Design a protein around this ligand. Sequence first.
Ligand SMILES: O[C@H]1CNCC[C@@H]1n1cc(-c2ccccn2)nn1
Ligand SMILES: O[C@H]1CNCC[C@@H]1n1cc(-c2ccccn2)nn1
Length: 330
Amino acid sequence: STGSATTTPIDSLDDAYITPVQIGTPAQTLNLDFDTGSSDLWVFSSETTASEVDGQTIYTPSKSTTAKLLSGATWSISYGDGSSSSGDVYTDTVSVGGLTVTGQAVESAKKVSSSFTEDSTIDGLLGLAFSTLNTVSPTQQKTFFDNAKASLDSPVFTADLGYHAPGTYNFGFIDTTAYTGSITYTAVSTKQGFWEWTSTGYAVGSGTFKSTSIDGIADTGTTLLYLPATVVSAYWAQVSGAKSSSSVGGYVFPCSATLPSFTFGVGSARIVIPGDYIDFGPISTGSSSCFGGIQSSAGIGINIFGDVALKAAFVVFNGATTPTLGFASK
Ligand SMILES: O[C@H]1CNCC[C@@H]1n1cc(-c2ccccn2)nn1
Ligand SMILES: O[C@H]1CNCC[C@@H]1n1cc(-c2ccccn2)nn1
């Protein structure tokens, strides 16, 4: 089997991407944030505290004839932006782009934090990191990908995120028309439950490539590119007037600037992030200071190849017995 679904930026800045997902019988279609950095499939629901729902589409398990409460199971998750959510658990049928999993754990939110409430475009998350990170207790549950994997033509999914444009998540096959050149594969460590890999280095604009190992994660659920302070300083030094602003919370730059590209290494291959992908617009409405899309990972503890980086590539998440990651230009 295979599945294929279009993923769409939630706003004009590509702050996140949503992908329609069918849950239950009859189907309830929710727009979920596919997140290769976490491992819970959770949704706004008829159980979510009413004051914490503001425009999202909800899952109502009592209207799904295939929903079953998972007895005694709860979940609770926190994300690196300070957000969180928690609730109870159903199993139900979940389909993405024509690929169907029966008995998927669907984590129904009873509580969500303010950032989730304030984002009316995101009805929940679909985690695509390794199932070892799933938060359901007392019996951990499997991700959608893990449940689908044995039925897929090939045990893979691909992320093709657009810049200011739709894109695609495919399950079970590699669309050889969706990229240019070849796919370079690189080793993955699952020891932290992430799609963790080592980039071979970077370049800023037309500058010389610096060969240096950068361990980080391929994370579709994080917007920005978070890299070591030395690397980020080298990037912003090429943008006249850019500064790290403690009040704003990272590097900002004059909105009139033209940003240089940023290249990262995948083995001997190179992925070029165009400068425009690094512009996240005015820091507040009407300001002429703009937020940068490359920020220091110093306070995180891991480097994160978020959407800024991934959207410059066609990315293969290879879930074979020894997982690997593939990157191609596109
Ligand atoms: O949410 C976490 C889920 N697992 C992978 C890492 C990810 N992540 C995101 C951030 C972060 C940090 C600062 C500002 C915004 N996001 N830190 N970790
Ligand atoms: O990574 C993202 C995962 N979904 C929740 C918001 C989170 N997020 C975004 C930003 C951000 C975006 C643009 C400019 C400055 N900050 N910080 N955290």
